[PDB]
Coordinates of C-alpha atoms in Angstrom, one line a residue:
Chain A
X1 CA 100.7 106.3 89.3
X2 CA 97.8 104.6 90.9
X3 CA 95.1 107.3 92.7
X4 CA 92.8 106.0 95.2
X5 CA 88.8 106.4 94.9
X6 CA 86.7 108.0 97.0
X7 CA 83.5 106.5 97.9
X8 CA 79.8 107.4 98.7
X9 CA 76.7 106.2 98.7
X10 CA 73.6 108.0 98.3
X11 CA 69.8 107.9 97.3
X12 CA 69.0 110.1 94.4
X13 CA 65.9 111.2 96.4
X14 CA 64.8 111.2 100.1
X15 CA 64.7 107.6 101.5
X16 CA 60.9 106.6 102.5
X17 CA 60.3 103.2 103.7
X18 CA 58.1 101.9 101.1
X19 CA 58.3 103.7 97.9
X20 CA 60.3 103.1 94.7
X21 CA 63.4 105.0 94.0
X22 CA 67.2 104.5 93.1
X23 CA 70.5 103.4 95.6
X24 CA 73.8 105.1 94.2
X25 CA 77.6 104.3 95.0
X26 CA 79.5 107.3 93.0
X27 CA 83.6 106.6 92.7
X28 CA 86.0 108.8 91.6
X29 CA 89.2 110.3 92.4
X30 CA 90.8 106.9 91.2
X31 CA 92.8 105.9 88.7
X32 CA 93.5 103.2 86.9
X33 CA 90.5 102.1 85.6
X34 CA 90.2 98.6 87.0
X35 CA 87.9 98.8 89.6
X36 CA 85.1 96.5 91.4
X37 CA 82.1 98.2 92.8
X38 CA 79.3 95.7 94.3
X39 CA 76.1 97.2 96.2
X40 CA 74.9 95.4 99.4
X41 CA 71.4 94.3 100.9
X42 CA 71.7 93.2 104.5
X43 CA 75.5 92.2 103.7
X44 CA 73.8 90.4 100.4
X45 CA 75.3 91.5 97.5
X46 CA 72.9 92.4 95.0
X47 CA 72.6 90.9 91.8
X48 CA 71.4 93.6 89.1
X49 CA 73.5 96.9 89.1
X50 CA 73.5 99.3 86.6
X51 CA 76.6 101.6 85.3
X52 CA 77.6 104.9 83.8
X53 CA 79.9 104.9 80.9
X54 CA 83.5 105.8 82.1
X55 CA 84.5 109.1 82.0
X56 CA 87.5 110.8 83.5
X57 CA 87.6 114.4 85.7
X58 CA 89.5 117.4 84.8
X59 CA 92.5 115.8 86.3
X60 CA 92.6 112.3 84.7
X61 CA 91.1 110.5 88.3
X62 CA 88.3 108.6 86.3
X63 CA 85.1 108.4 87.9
X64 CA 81.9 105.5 87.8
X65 CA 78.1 106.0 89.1
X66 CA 76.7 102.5 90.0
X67 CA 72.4 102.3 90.7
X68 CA 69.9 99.9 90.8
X69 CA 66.5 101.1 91.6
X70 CA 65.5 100.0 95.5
X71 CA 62.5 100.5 98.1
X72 CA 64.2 101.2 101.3
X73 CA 63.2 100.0 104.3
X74 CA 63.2 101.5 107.8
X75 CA 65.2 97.9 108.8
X76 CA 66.9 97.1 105.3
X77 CA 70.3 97.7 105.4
X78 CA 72.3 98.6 102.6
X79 CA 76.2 99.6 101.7
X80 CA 78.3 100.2 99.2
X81 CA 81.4 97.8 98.8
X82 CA 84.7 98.4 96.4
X83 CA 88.1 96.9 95.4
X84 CA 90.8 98.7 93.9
X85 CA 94.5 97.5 93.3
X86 CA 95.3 100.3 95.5
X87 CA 93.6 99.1 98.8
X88 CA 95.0 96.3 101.0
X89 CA 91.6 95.1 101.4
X90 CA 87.7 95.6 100.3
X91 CA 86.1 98.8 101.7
X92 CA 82.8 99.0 102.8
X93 CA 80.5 102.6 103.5
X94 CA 77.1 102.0 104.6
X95 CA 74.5 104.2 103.3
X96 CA 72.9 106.7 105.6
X97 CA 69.2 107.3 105.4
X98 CA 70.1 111.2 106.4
X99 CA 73.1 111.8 104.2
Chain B
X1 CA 76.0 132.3 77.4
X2 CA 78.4 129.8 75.1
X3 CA 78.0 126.0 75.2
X4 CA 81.1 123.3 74.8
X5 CA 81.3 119.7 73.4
X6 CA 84.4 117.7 74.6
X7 CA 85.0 114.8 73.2
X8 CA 86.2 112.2 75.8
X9 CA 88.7 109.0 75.2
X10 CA 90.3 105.9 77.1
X11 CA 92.4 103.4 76.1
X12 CA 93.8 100.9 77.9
X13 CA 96.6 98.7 76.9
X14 CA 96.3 94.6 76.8
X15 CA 99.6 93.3 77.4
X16 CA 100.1 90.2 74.7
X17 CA 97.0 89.0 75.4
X18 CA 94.7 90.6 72.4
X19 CA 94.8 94.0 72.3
X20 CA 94.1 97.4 74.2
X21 CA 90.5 98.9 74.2
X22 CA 89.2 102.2 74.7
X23 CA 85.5 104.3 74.7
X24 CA 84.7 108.0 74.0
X25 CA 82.1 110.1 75.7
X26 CA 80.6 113.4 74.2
X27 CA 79.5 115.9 76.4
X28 CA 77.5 119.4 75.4
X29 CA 78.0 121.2 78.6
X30 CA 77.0 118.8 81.6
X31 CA 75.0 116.5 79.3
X32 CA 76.2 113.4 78.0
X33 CA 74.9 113.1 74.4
X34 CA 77.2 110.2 73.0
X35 CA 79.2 107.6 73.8
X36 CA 80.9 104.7 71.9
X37 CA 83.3 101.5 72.5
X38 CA 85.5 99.3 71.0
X39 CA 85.0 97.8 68.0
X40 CA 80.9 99.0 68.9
X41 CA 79.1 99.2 64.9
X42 CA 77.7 102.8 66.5
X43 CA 77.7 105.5 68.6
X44 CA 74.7 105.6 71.4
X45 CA 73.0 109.0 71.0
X46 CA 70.3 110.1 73.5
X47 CA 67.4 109.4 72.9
X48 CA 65.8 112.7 73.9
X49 CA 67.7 114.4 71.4
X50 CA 65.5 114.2 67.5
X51 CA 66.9 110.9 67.0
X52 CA 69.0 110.9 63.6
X53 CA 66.2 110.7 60.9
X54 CA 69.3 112.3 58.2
X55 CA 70.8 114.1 61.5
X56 CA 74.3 114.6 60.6
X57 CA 75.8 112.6 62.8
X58 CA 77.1 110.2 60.5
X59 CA 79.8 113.4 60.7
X60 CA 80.7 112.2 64.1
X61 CA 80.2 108.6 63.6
X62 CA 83.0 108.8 60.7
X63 CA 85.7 111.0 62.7
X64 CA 85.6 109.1 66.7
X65 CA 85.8 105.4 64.7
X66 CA 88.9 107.0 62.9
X67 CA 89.8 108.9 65.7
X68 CA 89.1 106.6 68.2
X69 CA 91.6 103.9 66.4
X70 CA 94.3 106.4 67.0
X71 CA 95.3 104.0 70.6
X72 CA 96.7 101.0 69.3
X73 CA 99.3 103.0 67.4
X74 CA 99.1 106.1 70.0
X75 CA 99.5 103.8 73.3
X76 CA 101.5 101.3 71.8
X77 CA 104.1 103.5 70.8
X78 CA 103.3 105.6 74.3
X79 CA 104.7 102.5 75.9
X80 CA 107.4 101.9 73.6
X81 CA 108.7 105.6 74.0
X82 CA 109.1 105.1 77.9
X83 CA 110.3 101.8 77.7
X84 CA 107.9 100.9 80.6
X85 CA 108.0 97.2 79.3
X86 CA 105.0 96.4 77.7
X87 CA 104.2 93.6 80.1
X88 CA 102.2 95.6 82.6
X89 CA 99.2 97.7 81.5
X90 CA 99.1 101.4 81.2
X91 CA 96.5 104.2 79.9
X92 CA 96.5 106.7 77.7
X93 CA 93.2 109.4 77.9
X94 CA 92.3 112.0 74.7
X95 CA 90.4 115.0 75.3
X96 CA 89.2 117.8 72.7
X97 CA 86.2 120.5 72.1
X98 CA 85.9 123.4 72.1
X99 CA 83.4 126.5 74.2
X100 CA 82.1 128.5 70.8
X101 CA 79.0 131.6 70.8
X102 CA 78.0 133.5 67.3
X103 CA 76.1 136.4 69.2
X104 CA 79.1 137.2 71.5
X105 CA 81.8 135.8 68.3
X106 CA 84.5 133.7 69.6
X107 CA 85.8 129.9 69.4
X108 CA 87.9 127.9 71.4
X109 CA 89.8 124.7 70.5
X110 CA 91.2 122.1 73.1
X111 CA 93.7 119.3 73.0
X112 CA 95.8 117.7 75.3
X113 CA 96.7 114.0 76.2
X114 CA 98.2 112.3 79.0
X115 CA 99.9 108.8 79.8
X116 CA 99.0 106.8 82.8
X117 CA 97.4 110.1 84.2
X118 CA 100.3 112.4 83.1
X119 CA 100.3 115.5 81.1
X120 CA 102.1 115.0 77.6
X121 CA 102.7 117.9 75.2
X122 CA 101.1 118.4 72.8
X123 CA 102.4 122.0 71.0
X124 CA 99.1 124.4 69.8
X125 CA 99.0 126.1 72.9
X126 CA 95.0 126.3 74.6
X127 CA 93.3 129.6 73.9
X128 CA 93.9 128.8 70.1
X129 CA 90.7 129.6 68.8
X130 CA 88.6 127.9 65.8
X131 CA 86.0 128.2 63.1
X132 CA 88.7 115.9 57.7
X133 CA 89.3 118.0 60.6
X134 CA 86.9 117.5 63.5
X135 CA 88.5 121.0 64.8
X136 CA 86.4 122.9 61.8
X137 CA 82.8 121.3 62.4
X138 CA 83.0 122.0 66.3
X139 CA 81.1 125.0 66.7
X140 CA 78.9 124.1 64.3
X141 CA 78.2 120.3 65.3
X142 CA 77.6 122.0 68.6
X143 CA 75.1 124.5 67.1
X144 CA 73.3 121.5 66.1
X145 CA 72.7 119.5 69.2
X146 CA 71.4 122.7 70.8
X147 CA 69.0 122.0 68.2
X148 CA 68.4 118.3 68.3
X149 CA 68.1 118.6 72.5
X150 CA 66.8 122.3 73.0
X151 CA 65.0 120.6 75.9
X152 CA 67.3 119.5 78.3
X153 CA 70.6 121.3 76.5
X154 CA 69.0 125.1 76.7
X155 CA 67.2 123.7 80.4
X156 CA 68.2 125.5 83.6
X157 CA 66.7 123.4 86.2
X158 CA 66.6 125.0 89.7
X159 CA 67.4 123.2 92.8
X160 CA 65.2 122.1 95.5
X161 CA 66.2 122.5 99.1
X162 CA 65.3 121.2 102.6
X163 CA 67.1 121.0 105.3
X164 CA 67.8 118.4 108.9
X165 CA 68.5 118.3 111.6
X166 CA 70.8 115.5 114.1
X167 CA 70.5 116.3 117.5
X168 CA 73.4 113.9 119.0
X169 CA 74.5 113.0 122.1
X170 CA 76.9 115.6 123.2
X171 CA 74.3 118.3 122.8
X172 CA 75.9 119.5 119.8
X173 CA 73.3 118.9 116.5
X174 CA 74.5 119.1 112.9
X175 CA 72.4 120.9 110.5
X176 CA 72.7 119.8 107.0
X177 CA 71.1 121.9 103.6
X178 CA 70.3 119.7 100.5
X179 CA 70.3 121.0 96.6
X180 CA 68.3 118.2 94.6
X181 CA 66.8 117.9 90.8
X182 CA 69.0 121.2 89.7
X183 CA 71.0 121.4 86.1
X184 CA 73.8 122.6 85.2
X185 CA 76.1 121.5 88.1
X186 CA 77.2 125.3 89.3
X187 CA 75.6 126.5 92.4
X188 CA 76.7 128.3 95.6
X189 CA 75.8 126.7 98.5
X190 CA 76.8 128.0 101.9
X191 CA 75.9 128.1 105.8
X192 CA 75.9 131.4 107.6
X193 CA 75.3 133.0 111.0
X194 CA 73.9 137.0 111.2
X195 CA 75.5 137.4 107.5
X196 CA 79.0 136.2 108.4
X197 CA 79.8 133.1 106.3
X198 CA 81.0 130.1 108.1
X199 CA 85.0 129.7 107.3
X200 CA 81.4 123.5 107.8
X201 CA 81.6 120.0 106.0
X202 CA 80.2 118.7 102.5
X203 CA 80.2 116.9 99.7
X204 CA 81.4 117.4 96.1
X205 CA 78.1 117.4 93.6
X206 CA 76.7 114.2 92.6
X207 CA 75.0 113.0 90.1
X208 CA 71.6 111.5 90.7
X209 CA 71.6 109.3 87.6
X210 CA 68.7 111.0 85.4
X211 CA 70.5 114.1 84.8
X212 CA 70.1 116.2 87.9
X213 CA 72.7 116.7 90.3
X214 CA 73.1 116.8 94.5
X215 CA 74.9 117.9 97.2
X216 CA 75.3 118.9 100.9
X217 CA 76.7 121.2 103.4
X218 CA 76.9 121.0 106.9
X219 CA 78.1 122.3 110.2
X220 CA 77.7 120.9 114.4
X221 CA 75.4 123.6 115.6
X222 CA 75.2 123.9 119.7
X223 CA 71.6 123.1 120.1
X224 CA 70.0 126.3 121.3
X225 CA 72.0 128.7 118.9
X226 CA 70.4 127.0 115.6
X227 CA 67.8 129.5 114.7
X228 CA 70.2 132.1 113.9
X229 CA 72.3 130.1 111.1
X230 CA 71.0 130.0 107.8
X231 CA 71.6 128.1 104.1
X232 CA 71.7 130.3 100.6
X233 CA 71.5 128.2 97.9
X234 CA 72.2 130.2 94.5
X235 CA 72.0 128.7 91.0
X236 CA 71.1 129.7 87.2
X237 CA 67.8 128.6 87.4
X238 CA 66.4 130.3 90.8
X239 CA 64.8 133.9 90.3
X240 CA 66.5 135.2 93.0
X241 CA 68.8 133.5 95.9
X242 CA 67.6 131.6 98.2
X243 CA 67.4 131.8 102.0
X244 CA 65.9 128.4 103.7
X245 CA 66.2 128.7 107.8
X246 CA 66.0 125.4 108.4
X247 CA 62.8 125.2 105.8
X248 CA 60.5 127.0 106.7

């Protein structure tokens, strides 16, 4: 009736501190569509986030890619936040430099 | 080597308060090549593609704006059916295409739909076969992208590989292997020990947002006995498998 997402948040290449690249929060595993993805600087939400046009999987749990291009910092923290009508509450996964 | 071109399709229902939506995708293999909204005036075709100049997709164009107007009176009467109440919202998701090849001579022709993430039948059956019927220009609208795109379409990009290493606390590390920049999204990707497989964590592949894909795997590794596991990464586009020890 209602499937729960499943998040991660990645950089589409290897994170070095100074150099320009792309942050991405992929969902999936979810369904229904309404959902709320917002990316994170330093608990900052940040303001210009780009989308992928909504597709579903194989088995109906629709999936999103959210970027924005980013130059990550060695103290810059960043994180992935979302909101489904599934989930008592907002969850948050930071991103991990080495994953 | 065939090639597919599924035709994706949600619609969501807007209870008394306008109407439902909805917004197809088109895929040729694990490349998205069109999509299209509600009440849009056109269909977005990649750009890398030759760019309509008299490209036939006015073909397409014509059948998803018909086809895609098939939710307000396929939804609607979805909701009516169950007697769900039409006061909440509910979702109804089309999928067709087909996987066709000359040289090898065979088609393939898919339909099914489901409500609210449910299987609904449909009656055809699935390995039904094929050639104002978008089921009859399917293998040969695909034979045309191939042709429009035969730079990213007929592409098998190989994956790039490197591997890390997290020493932790314990005095156990965890070794993880990478697979960037590759295309399609099949590969192999597994962590060994002196040829016996580990029966290990990871992560479904990703996309990377330009068209490439990603992914992972990983294992805790007793740091001393880390020199004698290993990560094979097989894909279309390698010449032959490879064997990265921790990248050297």
């Amino acid at each position: 009736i209602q499937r729960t997402p499943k998040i991660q948040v990645y950089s589409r290449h290897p994170a070095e501190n100074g150099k320009s690249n792309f942050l991405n929060c992929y969902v999936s595993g979810f369904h229904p569509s309404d959902i709320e993805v917002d990316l994170l600087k330093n608990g900052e939400r940040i303001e210009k986030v780009e989308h992928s046009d909504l597709s579903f999987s194989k088995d109906w749990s629709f999936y999103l890619l959210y970027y924005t291009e980013f130059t990550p910092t060695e103290k810059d923290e960043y994180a992935c936040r979302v909101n489904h009508v599934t989930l008592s509450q907002p969850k948050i996964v930071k991103w991990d430099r080495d994953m | 080597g065939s090639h597919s071109l599924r035709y994706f399709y949600t619609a969501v229902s807007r209870p008394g308060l306008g109407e439902p939506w909805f917004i197809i995708v088109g895929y040729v293999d694990d490349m998205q090549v069109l999509r299209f909204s509600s009440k849009e005036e056109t269909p977005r075709m990649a750009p890398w593609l030759e760019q309509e100049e008299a490209d036939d997709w006015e073909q397409q164009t014509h059948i998803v704006t018909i086809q895609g107007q098939l939710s307000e009176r396929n939804l609607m009467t979805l909701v009516h059916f169950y007697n769900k109440s039409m006061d909440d919202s509910h979702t109804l998701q089309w999928l067709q295409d087909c996987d066709v090849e000359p040289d090898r001579h065979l088609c393939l022709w898919y339909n099914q739909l489901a409500y609210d993430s449910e299987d609904l039948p449909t009656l055809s059956e699935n390995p039904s076969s094929c050639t104002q019927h978008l089921e009859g220009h399917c293998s040969d609208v695909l034979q045309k992208y191939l042709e429009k795109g035969k730079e990213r379409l007929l592409r098998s990009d190989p994956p790039k590989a490197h591997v890390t290493r997290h020493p932790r606390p314990e005095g156990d590390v965890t070794l993880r292997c990478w697979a960037l920049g590759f295309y399609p999204a099949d590969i192999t990707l597994t962590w060994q020990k002196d040829g016996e497989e580990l029966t290990v964590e990871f992560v479904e592949t990703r996309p990377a947002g330009d068209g490439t894909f990603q992914k992972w795997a990983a294992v805790v590794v007793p740091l001393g006995k880390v020199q004698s596991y290993t990560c094979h990464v097989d894909h279309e586009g390698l010449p032959e498998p490879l064997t990265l020890r921790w990248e050297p």
